[PDB]
mmCIF file with all atom_site columns, C-alpha atoms in Angstrom:
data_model
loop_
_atom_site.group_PDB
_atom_site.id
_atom_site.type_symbol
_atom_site.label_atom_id
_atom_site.label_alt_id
_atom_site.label_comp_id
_atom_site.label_asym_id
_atom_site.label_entity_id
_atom_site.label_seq_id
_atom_site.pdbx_PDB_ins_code
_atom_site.Cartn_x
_atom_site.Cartn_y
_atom_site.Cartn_z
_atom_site.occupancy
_atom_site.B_iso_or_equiv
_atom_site.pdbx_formal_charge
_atom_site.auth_seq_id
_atom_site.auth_comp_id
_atom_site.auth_asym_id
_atom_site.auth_atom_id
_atom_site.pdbx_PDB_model_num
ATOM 1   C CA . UNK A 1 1  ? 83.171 26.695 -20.012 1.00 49.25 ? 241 UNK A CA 1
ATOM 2   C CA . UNK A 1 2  ? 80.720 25.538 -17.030 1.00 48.22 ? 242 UNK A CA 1
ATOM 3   C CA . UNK A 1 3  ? 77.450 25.104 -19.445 1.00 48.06 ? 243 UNK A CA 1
ATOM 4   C CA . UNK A 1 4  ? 79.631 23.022 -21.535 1.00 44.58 ? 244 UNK A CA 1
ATOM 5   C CA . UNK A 1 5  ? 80.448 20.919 -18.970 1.00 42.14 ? 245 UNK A CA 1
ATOM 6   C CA . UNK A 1 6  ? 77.101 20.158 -18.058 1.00 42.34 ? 246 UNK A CA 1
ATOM 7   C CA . UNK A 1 7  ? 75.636 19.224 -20.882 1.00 39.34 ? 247 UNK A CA 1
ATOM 8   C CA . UNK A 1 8  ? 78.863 17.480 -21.725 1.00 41.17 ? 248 UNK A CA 1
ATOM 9   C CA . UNK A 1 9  ? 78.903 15.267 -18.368 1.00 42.24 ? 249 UNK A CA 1
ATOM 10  C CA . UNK A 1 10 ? 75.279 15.494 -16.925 1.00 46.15 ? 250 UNK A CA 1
ATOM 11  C CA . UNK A 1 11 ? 72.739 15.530 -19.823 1.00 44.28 ? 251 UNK A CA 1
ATOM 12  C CA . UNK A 1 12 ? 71.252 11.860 -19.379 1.00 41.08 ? 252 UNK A CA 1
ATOM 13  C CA . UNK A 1 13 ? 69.051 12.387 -16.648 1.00 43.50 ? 253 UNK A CA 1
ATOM 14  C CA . UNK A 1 14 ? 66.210 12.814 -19.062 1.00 45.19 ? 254 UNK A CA 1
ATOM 15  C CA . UNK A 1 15 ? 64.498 10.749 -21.426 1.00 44.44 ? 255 UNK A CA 1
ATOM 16  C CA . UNK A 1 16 ? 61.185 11.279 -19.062 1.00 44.04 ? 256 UNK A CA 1
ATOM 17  C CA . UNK A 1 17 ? 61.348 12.155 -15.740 1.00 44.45 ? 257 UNK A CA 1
ATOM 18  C CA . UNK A 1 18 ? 59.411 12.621 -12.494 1.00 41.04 ? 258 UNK A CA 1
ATOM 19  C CA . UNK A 1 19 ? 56.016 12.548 -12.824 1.00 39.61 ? 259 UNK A CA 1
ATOM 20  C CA . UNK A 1 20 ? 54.556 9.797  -11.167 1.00 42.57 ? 260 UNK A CA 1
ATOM 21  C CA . UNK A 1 21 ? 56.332 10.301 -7.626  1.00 43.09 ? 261 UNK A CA 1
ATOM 22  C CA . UNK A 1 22 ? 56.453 13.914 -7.382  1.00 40.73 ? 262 UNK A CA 1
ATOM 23  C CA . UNK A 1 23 ? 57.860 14.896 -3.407  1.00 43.26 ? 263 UNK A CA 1
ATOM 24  C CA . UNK A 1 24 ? 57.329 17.752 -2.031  1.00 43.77 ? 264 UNK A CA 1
ATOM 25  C CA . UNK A 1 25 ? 58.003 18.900 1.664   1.00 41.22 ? 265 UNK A CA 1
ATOM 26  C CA . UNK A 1 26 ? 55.395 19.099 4.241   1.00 42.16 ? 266 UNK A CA 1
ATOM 27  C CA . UNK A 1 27 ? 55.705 21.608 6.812   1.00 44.28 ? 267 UNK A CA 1
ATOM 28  C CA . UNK A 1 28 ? 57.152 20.384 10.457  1.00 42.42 ? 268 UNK A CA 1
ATOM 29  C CA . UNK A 1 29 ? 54.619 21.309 13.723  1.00 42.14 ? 269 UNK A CA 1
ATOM 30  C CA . UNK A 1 30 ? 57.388 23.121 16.196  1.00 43.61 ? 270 UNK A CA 1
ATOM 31  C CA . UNK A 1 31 ? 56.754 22.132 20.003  1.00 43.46 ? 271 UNK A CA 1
ATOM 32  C CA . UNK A 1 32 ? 57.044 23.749 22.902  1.00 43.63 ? 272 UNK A CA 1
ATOM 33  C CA . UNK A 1 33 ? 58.798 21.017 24.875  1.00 44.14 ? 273 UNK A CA 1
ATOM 34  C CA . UNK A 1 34 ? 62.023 19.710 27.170  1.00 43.54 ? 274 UNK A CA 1
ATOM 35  C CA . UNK A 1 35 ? 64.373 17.365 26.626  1.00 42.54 ? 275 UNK A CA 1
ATOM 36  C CA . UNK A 1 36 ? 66.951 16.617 30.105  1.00 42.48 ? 276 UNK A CA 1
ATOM 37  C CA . UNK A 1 37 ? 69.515 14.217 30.105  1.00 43.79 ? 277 UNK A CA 1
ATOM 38  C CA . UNK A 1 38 ? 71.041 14.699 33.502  1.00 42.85 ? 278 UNK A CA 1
ATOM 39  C CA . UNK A 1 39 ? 74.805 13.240 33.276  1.00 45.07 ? 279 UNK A CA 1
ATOM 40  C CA . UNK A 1 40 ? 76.176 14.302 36.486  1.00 44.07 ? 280 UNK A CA 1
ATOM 41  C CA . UNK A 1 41 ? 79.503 12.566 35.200  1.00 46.52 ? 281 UNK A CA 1
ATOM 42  C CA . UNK A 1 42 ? 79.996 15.376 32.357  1.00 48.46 ? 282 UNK A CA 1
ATOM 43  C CA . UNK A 1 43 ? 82.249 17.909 33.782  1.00 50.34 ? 283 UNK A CA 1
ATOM 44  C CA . UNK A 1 44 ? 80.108 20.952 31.898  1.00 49.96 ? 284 UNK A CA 1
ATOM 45  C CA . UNK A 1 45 ? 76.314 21.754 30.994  1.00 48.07 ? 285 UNK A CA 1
ATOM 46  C CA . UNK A 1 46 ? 75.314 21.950 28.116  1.00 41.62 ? 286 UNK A CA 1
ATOM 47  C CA . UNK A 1 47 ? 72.208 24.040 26.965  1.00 40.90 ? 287 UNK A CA 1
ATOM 48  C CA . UNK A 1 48 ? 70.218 24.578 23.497  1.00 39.89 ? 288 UNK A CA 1
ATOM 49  C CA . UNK A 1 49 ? 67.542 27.164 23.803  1.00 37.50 ? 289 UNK A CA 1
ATOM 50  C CA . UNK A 1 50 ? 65.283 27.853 21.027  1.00 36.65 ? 290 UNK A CA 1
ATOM 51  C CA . UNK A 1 51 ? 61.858 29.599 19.697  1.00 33.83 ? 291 UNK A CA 1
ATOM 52  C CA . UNK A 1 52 ? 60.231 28.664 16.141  1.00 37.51 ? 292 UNK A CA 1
ATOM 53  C CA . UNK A 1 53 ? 61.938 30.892 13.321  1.00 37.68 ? 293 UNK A CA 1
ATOM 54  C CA . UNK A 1 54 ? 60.249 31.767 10.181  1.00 36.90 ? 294 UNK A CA 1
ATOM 55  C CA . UNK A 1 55 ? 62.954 29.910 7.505   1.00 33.59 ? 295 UNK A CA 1
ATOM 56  C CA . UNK A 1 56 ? 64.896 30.413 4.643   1.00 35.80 ? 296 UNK A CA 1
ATOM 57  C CA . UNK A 1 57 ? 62.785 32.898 2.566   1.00 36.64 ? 297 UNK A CA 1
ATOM 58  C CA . UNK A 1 58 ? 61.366 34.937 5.325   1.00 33.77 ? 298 UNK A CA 1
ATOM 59  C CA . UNK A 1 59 ? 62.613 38.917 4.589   1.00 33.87 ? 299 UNK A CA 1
ATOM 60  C CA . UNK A 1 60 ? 62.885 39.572 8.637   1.00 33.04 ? 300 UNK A CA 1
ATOM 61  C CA . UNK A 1 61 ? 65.636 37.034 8.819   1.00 32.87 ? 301 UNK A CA 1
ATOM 62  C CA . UNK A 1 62 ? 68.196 39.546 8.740   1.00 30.87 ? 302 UNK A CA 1
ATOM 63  C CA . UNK A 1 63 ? 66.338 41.427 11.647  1.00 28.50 ? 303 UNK A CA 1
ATOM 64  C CA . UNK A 1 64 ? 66.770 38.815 14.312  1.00 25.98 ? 304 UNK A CA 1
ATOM 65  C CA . UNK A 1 65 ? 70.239 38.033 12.815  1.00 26.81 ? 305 UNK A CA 1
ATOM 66  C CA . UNK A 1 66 ? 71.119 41.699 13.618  1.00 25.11 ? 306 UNK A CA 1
ATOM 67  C CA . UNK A 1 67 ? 69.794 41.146 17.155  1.00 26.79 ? 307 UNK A CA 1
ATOM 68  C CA . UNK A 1 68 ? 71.421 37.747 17.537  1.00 27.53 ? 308 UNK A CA 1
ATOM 69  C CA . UNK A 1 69 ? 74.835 39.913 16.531  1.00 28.80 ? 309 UNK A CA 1
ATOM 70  C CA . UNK A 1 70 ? 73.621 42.357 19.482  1.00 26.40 ? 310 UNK A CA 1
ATOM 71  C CA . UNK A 1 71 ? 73.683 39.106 22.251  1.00 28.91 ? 311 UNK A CA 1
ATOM 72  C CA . UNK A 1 72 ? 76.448 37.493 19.951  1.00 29.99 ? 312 UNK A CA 1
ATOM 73  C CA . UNK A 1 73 ? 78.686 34.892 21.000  1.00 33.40 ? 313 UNK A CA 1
ATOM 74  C CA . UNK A 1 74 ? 81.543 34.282 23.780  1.00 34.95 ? 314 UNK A CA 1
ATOM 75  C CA . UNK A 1 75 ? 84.309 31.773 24.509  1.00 34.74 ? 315 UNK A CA 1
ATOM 76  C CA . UNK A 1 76 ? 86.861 32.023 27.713  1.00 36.60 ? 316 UNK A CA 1
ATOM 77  C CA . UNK A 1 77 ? 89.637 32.968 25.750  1.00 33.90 ? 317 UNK A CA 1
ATOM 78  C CA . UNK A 1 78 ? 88.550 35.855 24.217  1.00 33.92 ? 318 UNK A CA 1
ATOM 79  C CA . UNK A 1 79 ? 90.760 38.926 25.295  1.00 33.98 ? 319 UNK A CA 1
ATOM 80  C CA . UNK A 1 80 ? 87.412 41.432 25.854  1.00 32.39 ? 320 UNK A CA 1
ATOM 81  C CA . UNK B 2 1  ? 69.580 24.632 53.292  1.00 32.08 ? 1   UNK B CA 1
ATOM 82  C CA . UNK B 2 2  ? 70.000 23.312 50.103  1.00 31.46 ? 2   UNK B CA 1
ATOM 83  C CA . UNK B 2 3  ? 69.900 24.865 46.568  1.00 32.65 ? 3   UNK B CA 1
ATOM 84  C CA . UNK B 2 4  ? 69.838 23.111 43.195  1.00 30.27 ? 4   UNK B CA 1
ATOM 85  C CA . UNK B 2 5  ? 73.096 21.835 41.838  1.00 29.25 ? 5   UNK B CA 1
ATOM 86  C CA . UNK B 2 6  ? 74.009 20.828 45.395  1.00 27.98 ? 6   UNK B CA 1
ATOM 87  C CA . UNK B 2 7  ? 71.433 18.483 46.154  1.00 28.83 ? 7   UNK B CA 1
ATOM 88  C CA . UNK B 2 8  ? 72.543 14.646 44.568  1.00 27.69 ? 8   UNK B CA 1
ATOM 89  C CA . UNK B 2 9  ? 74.383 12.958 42.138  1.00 26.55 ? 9   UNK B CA 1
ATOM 90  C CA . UNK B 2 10 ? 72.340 11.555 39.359  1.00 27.93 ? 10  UNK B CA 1
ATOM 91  C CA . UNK B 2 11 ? 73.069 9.731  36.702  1.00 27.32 ? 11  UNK B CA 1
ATOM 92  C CA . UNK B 2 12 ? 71.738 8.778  32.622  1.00 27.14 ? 12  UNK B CA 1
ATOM 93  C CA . UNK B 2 13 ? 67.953 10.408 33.096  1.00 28.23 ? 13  UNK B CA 1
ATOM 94  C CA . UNK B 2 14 ? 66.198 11.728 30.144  1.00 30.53 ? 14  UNK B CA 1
ATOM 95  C CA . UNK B 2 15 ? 63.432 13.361 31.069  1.00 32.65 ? 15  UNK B CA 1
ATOM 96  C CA . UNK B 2 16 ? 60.805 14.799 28.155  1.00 33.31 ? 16  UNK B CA 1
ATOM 97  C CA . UNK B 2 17 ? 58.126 17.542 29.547  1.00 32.18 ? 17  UNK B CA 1
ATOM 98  C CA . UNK B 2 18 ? 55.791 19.865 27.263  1.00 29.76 ? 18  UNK B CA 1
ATOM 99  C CA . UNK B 2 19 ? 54.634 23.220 27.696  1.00 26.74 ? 19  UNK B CA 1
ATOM 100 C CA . UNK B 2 20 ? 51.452 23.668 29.206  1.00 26.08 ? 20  UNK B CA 1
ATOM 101 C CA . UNK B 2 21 ? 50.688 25.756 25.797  1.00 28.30 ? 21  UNK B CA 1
ATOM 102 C CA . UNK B 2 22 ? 50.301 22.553 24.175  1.00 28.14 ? 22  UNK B CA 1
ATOM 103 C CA . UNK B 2 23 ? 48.905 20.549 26.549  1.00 27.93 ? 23  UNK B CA 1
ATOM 104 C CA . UNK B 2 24 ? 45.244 20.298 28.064  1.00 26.19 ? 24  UNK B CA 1
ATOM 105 C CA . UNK B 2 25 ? 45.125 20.517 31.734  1.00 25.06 ? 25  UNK B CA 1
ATOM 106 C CA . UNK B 2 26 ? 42.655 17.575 31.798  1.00 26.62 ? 26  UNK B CA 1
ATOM 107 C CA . UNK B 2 27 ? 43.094 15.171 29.261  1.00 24.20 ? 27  UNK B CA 1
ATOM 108 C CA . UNK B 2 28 ? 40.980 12.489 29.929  1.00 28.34 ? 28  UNK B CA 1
ATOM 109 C CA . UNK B 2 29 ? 39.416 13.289 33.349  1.00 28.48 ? 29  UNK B CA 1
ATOM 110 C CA . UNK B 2 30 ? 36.271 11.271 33.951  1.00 30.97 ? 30  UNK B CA 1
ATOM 111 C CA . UNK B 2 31 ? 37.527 8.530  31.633  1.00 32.87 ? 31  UNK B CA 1
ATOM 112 C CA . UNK B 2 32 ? 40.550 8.115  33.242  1.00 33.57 ? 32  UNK B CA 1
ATOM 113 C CA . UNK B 2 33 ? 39.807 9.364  36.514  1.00 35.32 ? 33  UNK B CA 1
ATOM 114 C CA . UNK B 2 34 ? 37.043 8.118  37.423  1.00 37.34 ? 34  UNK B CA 1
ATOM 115 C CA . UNK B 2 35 ? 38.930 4.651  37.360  1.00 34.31 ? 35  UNK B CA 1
ATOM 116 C CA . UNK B 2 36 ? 41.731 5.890  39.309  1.00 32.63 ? 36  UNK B CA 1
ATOM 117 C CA . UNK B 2 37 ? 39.568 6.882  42.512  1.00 30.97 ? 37  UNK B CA 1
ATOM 118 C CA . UNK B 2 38 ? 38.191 4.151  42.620  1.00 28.35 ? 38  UNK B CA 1
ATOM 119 C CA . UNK B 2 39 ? 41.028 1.669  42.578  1.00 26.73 ? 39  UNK B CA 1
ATOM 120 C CA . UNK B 2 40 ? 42.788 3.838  45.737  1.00 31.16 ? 40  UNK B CA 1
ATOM 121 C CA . UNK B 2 41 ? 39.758 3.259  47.319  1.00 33.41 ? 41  UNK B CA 1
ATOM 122 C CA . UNK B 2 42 ? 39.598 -0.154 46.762  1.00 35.49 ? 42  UNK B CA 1
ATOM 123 C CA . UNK B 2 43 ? 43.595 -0.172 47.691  1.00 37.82 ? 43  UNK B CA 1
ATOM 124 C CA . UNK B 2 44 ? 42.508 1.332  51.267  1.00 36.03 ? 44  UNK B CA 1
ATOM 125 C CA . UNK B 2 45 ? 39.137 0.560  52.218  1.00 33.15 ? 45  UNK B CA 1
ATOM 126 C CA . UNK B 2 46 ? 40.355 -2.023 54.274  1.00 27.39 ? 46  UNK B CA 1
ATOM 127 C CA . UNK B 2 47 ? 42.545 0.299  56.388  1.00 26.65 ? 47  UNK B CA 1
ATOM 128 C CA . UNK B 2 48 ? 40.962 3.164  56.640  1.00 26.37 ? 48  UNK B CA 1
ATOM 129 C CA . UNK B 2 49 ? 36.782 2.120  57.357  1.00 26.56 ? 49  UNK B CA 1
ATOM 130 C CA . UNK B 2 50 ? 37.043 -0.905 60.224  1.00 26.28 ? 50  UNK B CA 1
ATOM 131 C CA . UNK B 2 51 ? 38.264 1.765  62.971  1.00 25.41 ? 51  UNK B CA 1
ATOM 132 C CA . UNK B 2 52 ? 35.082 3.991  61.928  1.00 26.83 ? 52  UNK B CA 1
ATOM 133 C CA . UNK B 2 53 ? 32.713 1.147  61.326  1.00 27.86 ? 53  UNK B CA 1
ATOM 134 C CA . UNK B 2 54 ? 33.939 0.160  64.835  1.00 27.94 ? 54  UNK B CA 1
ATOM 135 C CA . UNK B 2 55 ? 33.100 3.787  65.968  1.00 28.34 ? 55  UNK B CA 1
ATOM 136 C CA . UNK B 2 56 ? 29.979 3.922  64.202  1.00 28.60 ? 56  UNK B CA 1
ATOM 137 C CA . UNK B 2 57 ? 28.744 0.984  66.317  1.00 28.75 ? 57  UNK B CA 1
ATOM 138 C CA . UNK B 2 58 ? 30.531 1.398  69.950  1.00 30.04 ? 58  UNK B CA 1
ATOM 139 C CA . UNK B 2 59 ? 28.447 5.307  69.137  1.00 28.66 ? 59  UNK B CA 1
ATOM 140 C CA . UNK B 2 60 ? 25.062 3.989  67.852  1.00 27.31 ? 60  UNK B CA 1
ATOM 141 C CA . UNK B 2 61 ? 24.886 1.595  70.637  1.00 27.92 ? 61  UNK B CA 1
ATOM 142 C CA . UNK B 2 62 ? 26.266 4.087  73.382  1.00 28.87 ? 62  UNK B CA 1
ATOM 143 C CA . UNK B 2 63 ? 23.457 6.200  72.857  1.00 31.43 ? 63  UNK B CA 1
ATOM 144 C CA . UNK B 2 64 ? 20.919 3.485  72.714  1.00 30.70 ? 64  UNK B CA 1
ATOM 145 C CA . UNK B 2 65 ? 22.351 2.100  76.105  1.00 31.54 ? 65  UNK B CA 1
ATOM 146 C CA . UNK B 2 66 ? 21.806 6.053  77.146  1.00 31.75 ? 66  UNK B CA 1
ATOM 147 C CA . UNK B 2 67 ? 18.784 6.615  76.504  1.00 30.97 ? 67  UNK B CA 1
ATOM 148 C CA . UNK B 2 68 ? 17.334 2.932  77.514  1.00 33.70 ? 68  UNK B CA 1
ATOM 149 C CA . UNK B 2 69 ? 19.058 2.677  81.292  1.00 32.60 ? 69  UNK B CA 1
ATOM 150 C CA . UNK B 2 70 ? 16.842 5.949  83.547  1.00 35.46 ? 70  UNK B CA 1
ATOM 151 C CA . UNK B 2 71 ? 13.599 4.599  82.525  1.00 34.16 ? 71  UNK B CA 1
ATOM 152 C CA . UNK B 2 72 ? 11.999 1.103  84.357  1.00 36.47 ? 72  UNK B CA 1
ATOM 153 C CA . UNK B 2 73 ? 8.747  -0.910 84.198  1.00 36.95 ? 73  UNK B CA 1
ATOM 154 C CA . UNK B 2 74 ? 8.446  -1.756 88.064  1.00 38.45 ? 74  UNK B CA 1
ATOM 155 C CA . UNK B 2 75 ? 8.825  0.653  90.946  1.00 37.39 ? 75  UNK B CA 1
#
């Protein structure tokens, strides 16, 4: 029913296609670096701490999720 | 004493800082500081050197005067 579809509703995006601007992604240089905006106005701090991960395809992915499970997550109204 | 978080209030200051992992410790440090020793120098100079110079000269006379005052030509 869903193959159907397709070629019923989005066949027409070929003819010719591509070839003379073909983008791919370059890979993005992670930093070791700071960014502080002191607000001493904003009742609550607010923090983002983070190392370079190893992206989508990378098998040990599910490792340091499994690790992140161990240190987890917490919110004041949580009844533990 | 005072700890952090109890020291001021400050206000809408973003500050961006790099780890000294990717960062040299001296970037440019002839080229640009060479330059820079020279113009504090040149910014003090004038404040620092006419006491000394004044030194130099109420001390290179002193001893002159010193030496030149136990000795005489007639009896």
């Amino acid at each position: 029913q869903l193959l159907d579809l397709a070629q019923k509703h989005f066949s027409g995006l070929s003819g010719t296609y591509d070839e003379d601007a073909v983008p791919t992604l370059s890979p993005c240089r992670f930093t070791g670096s700071q960014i502080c905006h002191r607000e001493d106005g904003l009742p609550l701090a607010h923090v983002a701490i983070a190392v370079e991960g190893p992206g989508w395809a990378h098998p040990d992915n599910v490792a340091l999720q499994v690790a992140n499970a161990i240190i987890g997550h917490y919110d004041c109204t949580y009844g533990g | 004493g005072r700890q952090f978080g109890h020291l001021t209030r400050v206000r809408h200051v973003i500050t961006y800082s790099l780890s000294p992992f990717e960062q040299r410790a001296f970037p440019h440090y002839f080229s640009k500081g060479i330059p820079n020793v020279l113009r504090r120098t040149r910014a003090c100079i004038l404040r620092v050197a006419p006491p000394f110079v004044a030194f130099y000269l109420v001390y290179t006379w002193g001893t002159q005067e010193f030496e030149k005052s136990k000795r005489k030509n007639p009896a």
